[PDB]
Design a binder for this molecule. Sequence first.
Ligand code: W9I
Ligand code: W9I
Lengths: 300, 237
Amino acid sequence: MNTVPFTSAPIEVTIGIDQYSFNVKENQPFHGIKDIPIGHVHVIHFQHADNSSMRYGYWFDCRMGNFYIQYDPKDGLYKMMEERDGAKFENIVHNFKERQMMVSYPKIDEDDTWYNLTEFVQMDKIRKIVRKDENQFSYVDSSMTTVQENELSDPAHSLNYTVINFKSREAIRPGHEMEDFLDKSYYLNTVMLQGIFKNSSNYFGELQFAFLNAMFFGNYGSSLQWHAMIELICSSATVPKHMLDKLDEILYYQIKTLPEQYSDILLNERVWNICLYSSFQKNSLHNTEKIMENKYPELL
Amino acid sequence: GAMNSSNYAELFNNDIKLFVDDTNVYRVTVHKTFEGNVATKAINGCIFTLNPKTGHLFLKIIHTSVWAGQKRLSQLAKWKTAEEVSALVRSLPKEEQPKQIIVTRKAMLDPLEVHMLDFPNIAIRPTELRLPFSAAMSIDKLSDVVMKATEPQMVLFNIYDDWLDRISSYTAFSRLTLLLRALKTNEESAKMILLSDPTITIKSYHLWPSFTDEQWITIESQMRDLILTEYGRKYNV
Ligand SMILES: NNc1ccc(Br)cn1
Ligand SMILES: NNc1ccc(Br)cn1
């Protein structure tokens, strides 16, 4: 079990850690989060009490380094940093643990939610879309745009998701226009899975990451990427049977976890109705369809 | 974006554009089978591709053999239309390729857009106009060439005959659409009007009769009456 130490909390802020969140008051004696499950990526995120504009945070993996949070009063945010001196760090943590100034990551033993939301999410891969190579952790916020959004303006601060575009030469073989536009299996299996992602795990990982950035930061371009990647599979007549079973699980747990009051914005009516009711895979998402109908029957 | 009454003069500027109308590409007769079920028999159709400035009509004839053994024909028909339009653009010299293509029906947008991916600078546009190009098969010589076709065939016409020698393209297009609107609302009366005077003939190299300017006014007037009449006979007014 690992620990992320906070130098202090000088501004009132709501702190997220994965799917959990807690309020910290201005100058409250808070010094971080302990008992973080090793083995998963994690995200630690922030929403200042004064300016609920800009949710922001940091993807990290405690196996890759000793990471801490310190407020920067010049840039006005909680920054993640790496402590390279291992003993300086162990000693910082031990003192704050002894003084019981840390919140415990509150995982119910029965609860596989975070595993289930991050099953294909690795951390070296995350950094291939959030490019900032001097750090082992990755910053994301509400307002970052994706590479594809910028095509339609600062490149260093973009989310380099895989561009998917159903009306592109990439998606459409010459002479197979109708075929490839109405059944996207070629684009899914040959172009994306075999070509770009290499395997279903890289497809699922980007897709799971897109979802989490949409939910945690209200990042709109992530939300677009998550829908696109769902739509490409559902609109393919030929999908490996293991991928559909796994997709049904992935989406189930995403839909399960979404705040009930954010469905209006984070869920695209056209995509979901097409995927659950019109598409080739309309019968292949039993768990996802059943939770969507019981939790959000209005959207449909 | 979409083409409507507000930007109507853009049709007659010097940027090459084509209208594409797919209404008559997939044509069937519906009939009873010996067992008392219903079946369709396809007949030859055409794509109506028209330069509204010049009158140049590229009439691609769609021979029923293209449907042989195919399913979901109304859907195929749109993609076949798009395939043929795209093949037409590629066959034209660069300086004759359109800058825009306007489809008369919105369901053509995605099929044409996908087939024209190689032409990113050609703008594919819908229209809010209700244009009467479906009545093109009420023009005897066009109907005749479609029905006689025994193979896929492209035939070239000027749908304005020699009108541009005397009138602008705006006026030529307004005449054309009035004639076709009339032929669509009451074909019999429309054709009666166009031929009632045996002294006015259709030149072998034309589609429509050789009216004088004055005779065209009288004609255009009678076509508007017909359209208003039918509008009454329809709604009772
Ligand atoms: N600069 N080293 C560190 C490490 C952890 C904390 Br909390 C504060 N300072
Ligand atoms: N399965 N590895 C992956 C793939 C994409 C992203 Br982002 C993260 N982890």
